[PDB]
Amino acid sequence: HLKPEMIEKLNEQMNLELYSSLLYQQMSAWCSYHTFEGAAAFLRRHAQEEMTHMQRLFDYLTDTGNLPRINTVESPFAEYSSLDELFQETYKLEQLITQKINELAHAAMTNQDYPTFNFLQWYVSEQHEEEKLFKSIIDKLSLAGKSGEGLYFIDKELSTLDTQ
Amino acid sequence: HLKPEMIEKLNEQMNLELYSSLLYQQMSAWCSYHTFEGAAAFLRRHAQEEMTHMQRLFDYLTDTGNLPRINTVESPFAEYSSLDELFQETYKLEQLITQKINELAHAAMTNQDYPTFNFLQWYVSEQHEEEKLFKSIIDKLSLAGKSGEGLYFIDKELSTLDT
Amino acid sequence: HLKPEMIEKLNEQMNLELYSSLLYQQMSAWCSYHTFEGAAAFLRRHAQEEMTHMQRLFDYLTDTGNLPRINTVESPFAEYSSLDELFQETYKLEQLITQKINELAHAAMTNQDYPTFNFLQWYVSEQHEEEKLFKSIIDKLSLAGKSGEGLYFIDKELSTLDT
Amino acid sequence: HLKPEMIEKLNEQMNLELYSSLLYQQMSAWCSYHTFEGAAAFLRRHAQEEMTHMQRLFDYLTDTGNLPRINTVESPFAEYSSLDELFQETYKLEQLITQKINELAHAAMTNQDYPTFNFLQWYVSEQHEEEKLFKSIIDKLSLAGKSGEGLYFIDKELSTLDT
Amino acid sequence: HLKPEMIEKLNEQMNLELYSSLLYQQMSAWCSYHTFEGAAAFLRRHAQEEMTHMQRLFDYLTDTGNLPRINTVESPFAEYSSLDELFQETYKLEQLITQKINELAHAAMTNQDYPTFNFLQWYVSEQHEEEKLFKSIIDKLSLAGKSGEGLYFIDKELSTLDTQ
Amino acid sequence: HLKPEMIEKLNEQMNLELYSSLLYQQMSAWCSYHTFEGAAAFLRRHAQEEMTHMQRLFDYLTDTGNLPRINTVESPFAEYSSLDELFQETYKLEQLITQKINELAHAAMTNQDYPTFNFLQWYVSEQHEEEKLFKSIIDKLSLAGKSGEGLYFIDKELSTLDT
Amino acid sequence: HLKPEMIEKLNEQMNLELYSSLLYQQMSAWCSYHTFEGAAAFLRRHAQEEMTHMQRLFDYLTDTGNLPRINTVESPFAEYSSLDELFQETYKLEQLITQKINELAHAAMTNQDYPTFNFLQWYVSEQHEEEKLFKSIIDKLSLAGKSGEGLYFIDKELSTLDTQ
């Protein structure tokens, strides 16, 4: 009893959360391969977090009598020139996700779908936290990332970052 | 480190496990949509388990100096005519995984890759457990799955199976 | 404080929740009378839950300087041809409540009543949970409700459902 | 010590108990193969119990200065047309054991072997409990065993019966 | 989905483990009859251990969709001239069992049956332990077994041997 | 018992592990003398670890009715130009140890010595972990090892690494 | 600091303790091969003890600014005609160690090396314990070691000797 438009938008965001999980997972291999073991462990944990975001959309869709649908997932494989460029990409992905959540909420308002607007609030709030988390990592690299010694400590901080 | 043939079969297996995870995820949606909430909960738990099979291959690739590559995943989306057909498919999928693992083990032997052969034993053993679990569900469905009532109870058992 | 239109839709919703409580109470009598004691126990618990939905609207009206008014309640008394028809009706009632809440939320927006919009989110969220609970009971009845035996078991599940 | 006739009937009974253990073991294989995993688990536990009946006769023979002799055991392998036929056979086997014990008790009396008569009371009493357990399983199968669904539930009960 | 050859080999080893249980049980009567109560108790416990080896093959066969089959079991009855000869026989039985496990593993390799090769590893490892256990008993008898006083202490050590 | 070839390769690997222990021990002195006390502590702990590797082979040889032989061990003493060079040598040594273990596993398979192949699995698995550990130290030195300050921290991390 | 003479005698002594470790280890295999498993265990534990005596010297040398040096270690492999003869050899070795420690102590006095004389007191005291331990084993053997039965008991004792 959601409108088809909203069902699909929700469904697409579910797929986006899935992609993001796999992108973070893939990025963790780049890190491991380039010796950034602590950044690898943060990314792997973050990948798992994103699956949780996926499952939550998946559950909203099944609970409203819909059939979520996992679409083709493009390969997340990429090359990065530095640890710094990899985290620039994570931050831009999180900004895209934020923007798609804003579009979903706007569409929910325009369609007068108050259940979905309310459901989305969890994501509005989480994306705020995500952008702070990923911006703080860029800010660390900016400040201390210009030597191997600096990278070595940031890598250590990443090994346990956000496990409060 | 490892031979090109081994790296490639490992990487392909890691992708098959990822696919399996998503297929179980997708099937649990089919189950919720058709009111089998227990089966859905079991499929969802099992999706997560398959992800850990993926990760263990991912971590062996990275630990051996290689860069695991998550390839494009085909949509797991499908139609099933019955819960029974859906679990037939899970069992076939698990027999395919069993077979690819055995092929990987045999490649390891013939390439004299003892570290890989040893790594794979975890999968040989897990696949023995996977096939019993999925076959036993099919057996439940053969025995008691021909009425709503039976499905009802099987669905309930599935809601806590293997927990 | 609040606009006349908002006070009135709130007050009407408070009365709909009261009615819902009594209707569930009345249905639990139909269930006891027809030997479905489990369904009766579940309906009785749910009647109490609906009363708390009533009270929360009552308390928001009073907290905003208004005097909530319990209007005459129509008799919830009715005949049902089956336990299945009875639960069809509970689900329709819950979809009607969902719809009135969404109308109330929309009125809140268009009146730029942000305190009321915020108060209503508790109901939007509760109604999402109500519809799943009632739909799942209907699904149980579709699957296993066509024999005495199935009803027996469904009745037993209902006796502890959502506790 | 004991008379030749007593030593021999004891030794034969010890072999019948061994055979019974293996027959229950073998039946549990038939049950697993046909998907009755609960019945299989119960048969397997019961096989172990029959082994302890064997051992107690073994230990009485040795304690009385005799050398117990495990004779050749016939293959317990067989085909059954149904789980019901299989449990019919367990019950017949248990009635045969009951009868051989009673013959042994009577031989003990007529040989004025009071130590043996006293030793055998453990078996008289155990056989009373064995026949109730096996008869009750047959009764479950008569009552609810005519559908997949019933078998399903009976199988589940068997998985924890007498534990 | 195991090959018939492997199913039968597994099945035969199951029967061998069963025989061995009954042989140990039978040997314990010889011991009791000849007053070696402690050796009797070790043998009875070992007989139970061998049944466990049987059940494990039995379970692998049922779990792979096969029907294990208990065959005719020959009588284990024998005469022994001494406690020492009885333990020579236990050691040779364990060497036979070891060899049949090696043949089963070789056949598994040749057939490319990696599940069965992996299953058999438990037995490769156990048989290593078994041969040490039974060799140590022969070594005790060799060293201290030549008098009744010696036999009396070895019999006492046997009464609680391998119950760690 | 085992074949002469297997006995000899096992004995030679026992000796290689012993040598490795003493090399780590000697390298720890180089590190102490050049003020890398944390590196020295890690190397001392690892020398003890390699001693356990030696023992497990010694014990397999004795348990199989053989007589292990500790051969003459050449002095492990050497000059290192840097801490980075020393750790490059430890990694090369672990690679050699891994390769010998793989040649031993191979010889076991082709001699059909399944007991030894099984025994060697512990080493296959251990050498996988040894290589990850020693490669990670060289990776730390590569990232952070180019200033006294960086060496200072790596040395700290090494003082408790892998405990 | 440390005079050359002292550094050398200390390093030699480190190497003798390393040799003694390996000799005890090699002797345990002899015991194992001849079925004296309790003796083998004792010697394996004692080879570990000697290694700690090696390490304590190693650390004294490094702590005084020297570079201890592990020299070539000659094969400890030997034939022993009996368990008794093997323990006669361990006793003689321990007397040699005692004597080398006393020569080191004397060298430390002659050279006015009070730090080293102090360091060596651990060894003086230890070697007094070592000699009692290995003498007591020979004394068990001369008393009860002339029958297989006697040997079986001493072997049992050896299996847990010196463990608290």
JSON list of C-alpha atoms in Angstrom, two decimals, chain A residues 56-163:
[
{"chain": "A", "resi": 56, "resn": "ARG", "atom": "CA", "xyz": [16.99, -2.26, 7.39]},
{"chain": "A", "resi": 57, "resn": "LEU", "atom": "CA", "xyz": [15.59, -1.11, 3.97]},
{"chain": "A", "resi": 58, "resn": "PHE", "atom": "CA", "xyz": [15.11, -4.77, 3.05]},
{"chain": "A", "resi": 59, "resn": "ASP", "atom": "CA", "xyz": [13.03, -5.27, 6.23]},
{"chain": "A", "resi": 60, "resn": "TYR", "atom": "CA", "xyz": [10.95, -2.12, 5.68]},
{"chain": "A", "resi": 61, "resn": "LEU", "atom": "CA", "xyz": [10.14, -3.38, 2.21]},
{"chain": "A", "resi": 62, "resn": "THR", "atom": "CA", "xyz": [9.14, -6.93, 3.35]},
{"chain": "A", "resi": 63, "resn": "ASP", "atom": "CA", "xyz": [7.20, -5.56, 6.24]},
{"chain": "A", "resi": 64, "resn": "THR", "atom": "CA", "xyz": [5.10, -3.34, 3.99]},
{"chain": "A", "resi": 65, "resn": "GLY", "atom": "CA", "xyz": [4.09, -6.31, 1.80]},
{"chain": "A", "resi": 66, "resn": "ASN", "atom": "CA", "xyz": [6.72, -5.76, -0.95]},
{"chain": "A", "resi": 67, "resn": "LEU", "atom": "CA", "xyz": [9.38, -7.91, -2.47]},
{"chain": "A", "resi": 68, "resn": "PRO", "atom": "CA", "xyz": [12.83, -6.34, -2.25]},
{"chain": "A", "resi": 69, "resn": "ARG", "atom": "CA", "xyz": [14.98, -7.13, -5.31]},
{"chain": "A", "resi": 70, "resn": "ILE", "atom": "CA", "xyz": [18.75, -7.29, -5.42]},
{"chain": "A", "resi": 71, "resn": "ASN", "atom": "CA", "xyz": [19.75, -6.01, -8.82]},
{"chain": "A", "resi": 72, "resn": "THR", "atom": "CA", "xyz": [22.96, -6.47, -10.84]},
{"chain": "A", "resi": 73, "resn": "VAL", "atom": "CA", "xyz": [25.80, -5.19, -8.66]},
{"chain": "A", "resi": 74, "resn": "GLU", "atom": "CA", "xyz": [28.55, -3.55, -10.60]},
{"chain": "A", "resi": 75, "resn": "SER", "atom": "CA", "xyz": [32.05, -4.44, -9.61]},
{"chain": "A", "resi": 76, "resn": "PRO", "atom": "CA", "xyz": [33.49, -2.15, -7.04]},
{"chain": "A", "resi": 77, "resn": "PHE", "atom": "CA", "xyz": [37.04, -2.80, -8.18]},
{"chain": "A", "resi": 78, "resn": "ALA", "atom": "CA", "xyz": [39.13, 0.33, -8.61]},
{"chain": "A", "resi": 79, "resn": "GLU", "atom": "CA", "xyz": [42.65, 1.58, -8.53]},
{"chain": "A", "resi": 80, "resn": "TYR", "atom": "CA", "xyz": [43.65, 4.30, -6.07]},
{"chain": "A", "resi": 81, "resn": "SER", "atom": "CA", "xyz": [46.85, 6.37, -6.14]},
{"chain": "A", "resi": 82, "resn": "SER", "atom": "CA", "xyz": [47.04, 6.84, -2.31]},
{"chain": "A", "resi": 83, "resn": "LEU", "atom": "CA", "xyz": [45.37, 6.22, 0.93]},
{"chain": "A", "resi": 84, "resn": "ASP", "atom": "CA", "xyz": [44.27, 9.80, 0.85]},
{"chain": "A", "resi": 85, "resn": "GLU", "atom": "CA", "xyz": [42.50, 9.44, -2.52]},
{"chain": "A", "resi": 86, "resn": "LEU", "atom": "CA", "xyz": [40.71, 6.27, -1.31]},
{"chain": "A", "resi": 87, "resn": "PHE", "atom": "CA", "xyz": [39.25, 8.16, 1.66]},
{"chain": "A", "resi": 88, "resn": "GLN", "atom": "CA", "xyz": [38.27, 11.10, -0.58]},
{"chain": "A", "resi": 89, "resn": "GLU", "atom": "CA", "xyz": [36.22, 8.49, -2.45]},
{"chain": "A", "resi": 90, "resn": "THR", "atom": "CA", "xyz": [34.61, 7.12, 0.71]},
{"chain": "A", "resi": 91, "resn": "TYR", "atom": "CA", "xyz": [33.59, 10.64, 1.68]},
{"chain": "A", "resi": 92, "resn": "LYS", "atom": "CA", "xyz": [32.02, 11.35, -1.71]},
{"chain": "A", "resi": 93, "resn": "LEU", "atom": "CA", "xyz": [30.16, 8.05, -1.63]},
{"chain": "A", "resi": 94, "resn": "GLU", "atom": "CA", "xyz": [28.73, 9.00, 1.80]},
{"chain": "A", "resi": 95, "resn": "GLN", "atom": "CA", "xyz": [27.68, 12.41, 0.35]},
{"chain": "A", "resi": 96, "resn": "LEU", "atom": "CA", "xyz": [25.96, 10.70, -2.47]},
{"chain": "A", "resi": 97, "resn": "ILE", "atom": "CA", "xyz": [24.16, 8.43, 0.00]},
{"chain": "A", "resi": 98, "resn": "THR", "atom": "CA", "xyz": [23.12, 11.44, 2.07]},
{"chain": "A", "resi": 99, "resn": "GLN", "atom": "CA", "xyz": [21.75, 13.14, -1.02]},
{"chain": "A", "resi": 100, "resn": "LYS", "atom": "CA", "xyz": [19.77, 10.08, -2.11]},
{"chain": "A", "resi": 101, "resn": "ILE", "atom": "CA", "xyz": [18.26, 9.85, 1.39]},
{"chain": "A", "resi": 102, "resn": "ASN", "atom": "CA", "xyz": [17.28, 13.54, 1.10]},
{"chain": "A", "resi": 103, "resn": "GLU", "atom": "CA", "xyz": [15.65, 12.87, -2.26]},
{"chain": "A", "resi": 104, "resn": "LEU", "atom": "CA", "xyz": [13.81, 9.86, -0.82]},
{"chain": "A", "resi": 105, "resn": "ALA", "atom": "CA", "xyz": [12.49, 11.99, 2.10]},
{"chain": "A", "resi": 106, "resn": "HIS", "atom": "CA", "xyz": [11.42, 14.80, -0.29]},
{"chain": "A", "resi": 107, "resn": "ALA", "atom": "CA", "xyz": [9.66, 12.28, -2.49]},
{"chain": "A", "resi": 108, "resn": "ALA", "atom": "CA", "xyz": [7.99, 10.85, 0.61]},
{"chain": "A", "resi": 109, "resn": "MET", "atom": "CA", "xyz": [6.75, 14.28, 1.60]},
{"chain": "A", "resi": 110, "resn": "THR", "atom": "CA", "xyz": [5.51, 15.13, -1.93]},
{"chain": "A", "resi": 111, "resn": "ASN", "atom": "CA", "xyz": [3.66, 11.78, -2.04]},
{"chain": "A", "resi": 112, "resn": "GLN", "atom": "CA", "xyz": [2.25, 12.26, 1.45]},
{"chain": "A", "resi": 113, "resn": "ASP", "atom": "CA", "xyz": [3.88, 8.99, 2.56]},
{"chain": "A", "resi": 114, "resn": "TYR", "atom": "CA", "xyz": [4.31, 9.71, 6.26]},
{"chain": "A", "resi": 115, "resn": "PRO", "atom": "CA", "xyz": [5.27, 6.10, 7.18]},
{"chain": "A", "resi": 116, "resn": "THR", "atom": "CA", "xyz": [8.21, 6.22, 4.74]},
{"chain": "A", "resi": 117, "resn": "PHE", "atom": "CA", "xyz": [9.20, 9.77, 5.81]},
{"chain": "A", "resi": 118, "resn": "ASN", "atom": "CA", "xyz": [9.32, 8.53, 9.37]},
{"chain": "A", "resi": 119, "resn": "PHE", "atom": "CA", "xyz": [11.27, 5.36, 8.44]},
{"chain": "A", "resi": 120, "resn": "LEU", "atom": "CA", "xyz": [13.81, 7.52, 6.62]},
{"chain": "A", "resi": 121, "resn": "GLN", "atom": "CA", "xyz": [14.62, 9.54, 9.65]},
{"chain": "A", "resi": 122, "resn": "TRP", "atom": "CA", "xyz": [16.93, 6.85, 10.97]},
{"chain": "A", "resi": 123, "resn": "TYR", "atom": "CA", "xyz": [18.95, 7.33, 7.69]},
{"chain": "A", "resi": 124, "resn": "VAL", "atom": "CA", "xyz": [18.89, 11.14, 7.85]},
{"chain": "A", "resi": 125, "resn": "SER", "atom": "CA", "xyz": [20.40, 10.83, 11.35]},
{"chain": "A", "resi": 126, "resn": "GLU", "atom": "CA", "xyz": [22.90, 8.06, 10.44]},
{"chain": "A", "resi": 127, "resn": "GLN", "atom": "CA", "xyz": [24.15, 9.90, 7.37]},
{"chain": "A", "resi": 128, "resn": "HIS", "atom": "CA", "xyz": [24.88, 12.91, 9.52]},
{"chain": "A", "resi": 129, "resn": "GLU", "atom": "CA", "xyz": [27.06, 10.68, 11.68]},
{"chain": "A", "resi": 130, "resn": "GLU", "atom": "CA", "xyz": [28.65, 8.99, 8.63]},
{"chain": "A", "resi": 131, "resn": "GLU", "atom": "CA", "xyz": [29.71, 12.28, 7.10]},
{"chain": "A", "resi": 132, "resn": "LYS", "atom": "CA", "xyz": [31.33, 13.37, 10.33]},
{"chain": "A", "resi": 133, "resn": "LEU", "atom": "CA", "xyz": [33.15, 10.05, 10.66]},
{"chain": "A", "resi": 134, "resn": "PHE", "atom": "CA", "xyz": [34.50, 10.07, 7.13]},
{"chain": "A", "resi": 135, "resn": "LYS", "atom": "CA", "xyz": [35.33, 13.81, 7.17]},
{"chain": "A", "resi": 136, "resn": "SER", "atom": "CA", "xyz": [37.34, 13.29, 10.41]},
{"chain": "A", "resi": 137, "resn": "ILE", "atom": "CA", "xyz": [39.46, 10.60, 8.58]},
{"chain": "A", "resi": 138, "resn": "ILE", "atom": "CA", "xyz": [40.24, 12.95, 5.69]},
{"chain": "A", "resi": 139, "resn": "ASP", "atom": "CA", "xyz": [41.13, 15.64, 8.32]},
{"chain": "A", "resi": 140, "resn": "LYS", "atom": "CA", "xyz": [43.58, 13.26, 10.02]},
{"chain": "A", "resi": 141, "resn": "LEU", "atom": "CA", "xyz": [45.32, 12.44, 6.73]},
{"chain": "A", "resi": 142, "resn": "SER", "atom": "CA", "xyz": [45.46, 16.11, 5.84]},
{"chain": "A", "resi": 143, "resn": "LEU", "atom": "CA", "xyz": [47.10, 16.96, 9.09]},
{"chain": "A", "resi": 144, "resn": "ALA", "atom": "CA", "xyz": [49.46, 13.99, 9.71]},
{"chain": "A", "resi": 145, "resn": "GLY", "atom": "CA", "xyz": [49.34, 12.00, 6.47]},
{"chain": "A", "resi": 146, "resn": "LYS", "atom": "CA", "xyz": [52.30, 13.57, 4.68]},
{"chain": "A", "resi": 147, "resn": "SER", "atom": "CA", "xyz": [54.97, 11.17, 6.05]},
{"chain": "A", "resi": 148, "resn": "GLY", "atom": "CA", "xyz": [55.24, 7.37, 6.47]},
{"chain": "A", "resi": 149, "resn": "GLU", "atom": "CA", "xyz": [55.59, 7.96, 10.17]},
{"chain": "A", "resi": 150, "resn": "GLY", "atom": "CA", "xyz": [52.32, 9.96, 10.15]},
{"chain": "A", "resi": 151, "resn": "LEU", "atom": "CA", "xyz": [50.61, 7.35, 8.01]},
{"chain": "A", "resi": 152, "resn": "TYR", "atom": "CA", "xyz": [51.80, 4.74, 10.46]},
{"chain": "A", "resi": 153, "resn": "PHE", "atom": "CA", "xyz": [50.04, 6.38, 13.38]},
{"chain": "A", "resi": 154, "resn": "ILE", "atom": "CA", "xyz": [46.87, 7.19, 11.43]},
{"chain": "A", "resi": 155, "resn": "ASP", "atom": "CA", "xyz": [46.83, 3.55, 10.36]},
{"chain": "A", "resi": 156, "resn": "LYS", "atom": "CA", "xyz": [47.02, 2.55, 14.01]},
{"chain": "A", "resi": 157, "resn": "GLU", "atom": "CA", "xyz": [44.20, 4.95, 15.01]},
{"chain": "A", "resi": 158, "resn": "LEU", "atom": "CA", "xyz": [42.07, 3.49, 12.11]},
{"chain": "A", "resi": 159, "resn": "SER", "atom": "CA", "xyz": [42.67, -0.10, 13.41]},
{"chain": "A", "resi": 160, "resn": "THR", "atom": "CA", "xyz": [40.34, 0.69, 16.32]},
{"chain": "A", "resi": 161, "resn": "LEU", "atom": "CA", "xyz": [38.43, 3.79, 15.12]},
{"chain": "A", "resi": 162, "resn": "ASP", "atom": "CA", "xyz": [34.63, 3.83, 15.80]},
{"chain": "A", "resi": 163, "resn": "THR", "atom": "CA", "xyz": [34.46, 0.70, 17.99]}
]
